[PDB]
Amino acid sequence: MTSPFKLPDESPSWTEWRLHNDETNQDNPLGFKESWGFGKVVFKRYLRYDRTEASLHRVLGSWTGDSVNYAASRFFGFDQIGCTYSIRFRGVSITVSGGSRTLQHLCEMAIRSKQELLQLAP
Amino acid sequence: MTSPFKLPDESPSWTEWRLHNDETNQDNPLGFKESWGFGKVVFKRYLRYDRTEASLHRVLGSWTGDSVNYAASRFFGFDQIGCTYSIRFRGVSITVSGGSRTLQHLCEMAIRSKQELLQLAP
RNA sequence: CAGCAGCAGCCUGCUGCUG
RNA sequence: CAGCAGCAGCCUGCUGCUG
């Protein structure tokens, strides 16, 4: 399957996660999780994120309106399907959802959501 | 029950809705729906919204971090409960969710979400 | 707009288990 | 971090019905 994502997954092993836990706290995780769902099919990423401007830039590059539309168009036809973006960081989940006919507006709200969550003050 | 909302519901009757439908389109609804959930209990509003600055100001006043905390604190105790804000406008739904311990950050993201959705270009 | 039903997903909270 | 299970809600899409 063609993913909407432009960067590889970065999930930590169980050992790396434990080590990070011993060293640090829910407000300073290794990163964030995000996902894109098109009908039944869901694509997921855990991406490292350290709250710098460099890191923000890098992770905002993990998908675009174009990469999402290319991935999503595989699943399209005459009938509308449900499409959903989710992101979770520091205890808060944001989900942006609606039909395929609205996908451009779902991307616009998804990217704005992602940016505001990742920049939310301590 | 004490609501998190500071303005009354504005749901249209079935007849008003039909009349509006005959006169206008999903991109020009009478307004938007939003809701706040605390554990099992959900509070809901349909609010008129006409995409002016005056109207934006008015509807952004429908809840505050304080009104949400007063309402939500009724349901609190030692264990965390789930808390959720949702808003739907013009085919797109945004939901912001997490545990009561995070409620201040849920409000901050909820209000930012609401503002961006209600201002999204045609 | 609202309520009801069938189907299909998704997210949140709680509890327990595994790695 | 990941997978599994019990419970409780929520949102999206499709289909049908009512007002």
Curated annotation (Swiss-Prot), chains A, B:
GO molecular function terms listed in the Swiss-Prot or TrEMBL record: RNA binding
Keywords for the protein's UniProt record, in alphabetical order: Host-virus interaction, Inhibition of host innate immune response by virus, RNA-binding, Suppressor of RNA silencing, Viral immunoevasion
Which cellular component appears as one GO term in the record?
virion component
Is RNA-binding found in the keyword set? yes
GO BP terms: symbiont-mediated suppression of host innate immune response
Domain of life where this protein originates:
Viruses
Q: What does this protein do?
A: Viral suppressor of RNA silencing which binds specifically to silencing RNAs (siRNAs). Acts as a molecular caliper to specifically select siRNAs based on the length of the duplex region of the RNA.
Q: Which family does it belong to?
A: Belongs to the tombusvirus protein p19 family.
Query: What does the annotation say about its assembly with partners?
Result: Homodimer.
Q: What is this protein called?
A: RNA silencing suppressor p19
Q: Which organism is it from?
A: Tomato bushy stunt virus (strain Ja9) (TBSV)
First and last residues shown, out of full length: 27 to 149 of 172
